[PDB]
Structure 1
Amino acid sequence: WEECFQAAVQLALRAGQIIRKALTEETETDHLVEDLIISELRERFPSHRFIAEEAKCVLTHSPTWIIDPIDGTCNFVHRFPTVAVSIGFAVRQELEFGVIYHCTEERLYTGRRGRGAFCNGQRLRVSGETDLSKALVLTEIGPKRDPATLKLFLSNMERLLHAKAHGVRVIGSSTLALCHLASGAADAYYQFGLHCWDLAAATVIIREAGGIVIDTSGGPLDLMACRVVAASTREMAMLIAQAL
């Protein structure tokens, strides 16, 4: 699906341009970026479907765009330089390609079904680490600050920390957090209550890099489940969904 993949690449970094020059300044950009991507993909393929924030995440069987104009909202506002656009694409209720741009570091993350995953030219591949005790695991807080998700939050980290994890990292971006996964920079990821536009693109990439992406339970991924376990190995992934 080249013309579309190319539309994704071309837009992800034009958006990525808009956000870099925006970060220099001292919600508008979001919409700007949103309405940029979605209006052009729209009347580029007027009959395609979309799934971005602006129930649920119900993926049909038709060619669907799954978009997050700005991932790293909060980071943006504090100008924490961990900000991203993520454009995923599905066909036949399968994830086709993904394109995730690190606006700051200028790293185009791409992933096509069966054709591998690359960051800036060269190929990516996960780690294969299977021993959780030797692993660097990623996760994120969340927008919602209810005492039930926050207790949750603290519950899973203890489990992961009592699971004897090498180190934990939370960077304010699930999209980039997972791209770290895909490239080997980390060995596992988890999170509850996260929308699927933050998931779609990263998954094809993580998969194409040789990794695994499942439901938190250890079962298969469920886009509407709003959760994830992404790992370097299905072993690692299993250890993580077990703990918690």
Structure 2
Amino acid sequence: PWEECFQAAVQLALRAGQIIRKALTELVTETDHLVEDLIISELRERFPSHRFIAEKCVLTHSPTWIIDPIDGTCNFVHRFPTVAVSIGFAVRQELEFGVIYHCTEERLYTGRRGRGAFCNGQRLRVSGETDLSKALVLTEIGPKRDPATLKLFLSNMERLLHAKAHGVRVIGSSTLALCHLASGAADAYYQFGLHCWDLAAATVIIREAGGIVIDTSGGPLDLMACRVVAASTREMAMLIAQALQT
């Protein structure tokens, strides 16, 4: 539930980052197995009693690892400079810490329960924006392409865009987009259809940076809902959830 685990995640995220950073000098799903294996093996061997969630999202009370070997897979393929590795750790059914490493830009985001968030030694702090017409909002599209999810994506985009959002961004990485929020580079984030291993780690760092993470409904976060609404402030969060729908 602490230190040796965190230290292990930081060194795993960095090693994983290197094999990824290299893979980016060309259907290569082999780099995905390469990372998830070098991680689950190490983590398992060093902590045999721990559980693992990675690519159902059921969180128990025992120490477990939520893991996203490679977030930003479509970016990875087209060599769009935005891919990350995510490692989150939970215990007693609550998020203890998260580690997200931006492979190309070499940025190590890390957060820990009650110890704050940090990107490469610097302390992260959310924007504090409350006004929606002054907000930069980020959002992605699930891996799905069915007319339904697409219908929802454009509608929320439309609704949110109606409420006078200052701007929207789609970068192909929910974990990396969440990190921008933690640091204040963005004011809010929203998505339907994102697996828990993408928001687990990120939530811990956003909470420690002063922001909030809740369900798209407005209620608390539900790691089984495959959804989320994170923002700089509660006023911001609730205003986003309001504008959303379905």
Bin the TM-score by the shorter chain: over 0.9
Q: Secondary structure at the match of 1:223?
A: coil
**Structure 1 residue 142, shift from structure 2 partner:** 1.9
**Structure 1 residue 234, shift from structure 2 partner:** 0.4
**1:82-113 deviation per Cα after TM superposition (whole angstroms, max 9, x unaligned):** 00000000011010010000001000000000
**Structure 1 residue 141, shift from structure 2 partner:** 1.5
Q: Which runs of 5+ in 1 are unaligned?
A: none
- Cα separation, 2, equivalents of 1:77 and 1:119: 26
**Structure 1 residue 24, shift from structure 2 partner:** 1.2
Q: Secondary structure at the match of 1:152?
A: helix
**Structure 1 residue 155, shift from structure 2 partner:** 0.5
Aligned position for 2:127: 127
**Structure 1 residue 143, shift from structure 2 partner:** 1.1
**Structure 1 residue 47, shift from structure 2 partner:** 1.1
**Structure 1 residue 185, shift from structure 2 partner:** 0.2
Q: Secondary structure at the match of 2:46?
A: coil
**1:32-70 deviation per Cα after TM superposition (whole angstroms, max 9, x unaligned):** 00101001101110110010019xx11000000000000
TM-score by length of 1: 0.98
**Structure 1 residue 171, shift from structure 2 partner:** 0.0
Aligned position for 2:168: 168
- Cα separation, 1, equivalents of 2:23 and 2:181: 27
Q: Secondary structure at the match of 2:108?
A: strand
- Cα separation, 2, equivalents of 1:8 and 1:29: 18
Aligned position for 1:9: 10
Q: Secondary structure at the match of 1:65?
A: strand
**Structure 1 residue 163, shift from structure 2 partner:** 1.0
- Cα separation, 1, equivalents of 2:214 and 2:131: 18
- Cα separation, 2, equivalents of 1:142 and 1:89: 23
**Structure 1 residue 228, shift from structure 2 partner:** 0.2
- Corresponding residue pairs, total: 241
Aligned-residue sequence identity (percent) comes to: 100
- Cα separation, 1, equivalents of 2:37 and 2:101: 17
Would you identify which runs of 4 or more consecutive aligned residues in structure 1 move more than 4 Å?
A: none
- Cα separation, 2, equivalents of 1:194 and 1:141: 8
**1:116-150 deviation per Cα after TM superposition (whole angstroms, max 9, x unaligned):** 00000110000010001000000001211000000
TM-score by length of 2: 0.97
Q: Which runs of 5+ in 2 are unaligned?
A: none
1:143-154 correspondence runs (5 A): 143-154=143-154
- Cα separation, 2, equivalents of 1:242 and 1:142: 21
2:36 to 34, 37, 42: 34
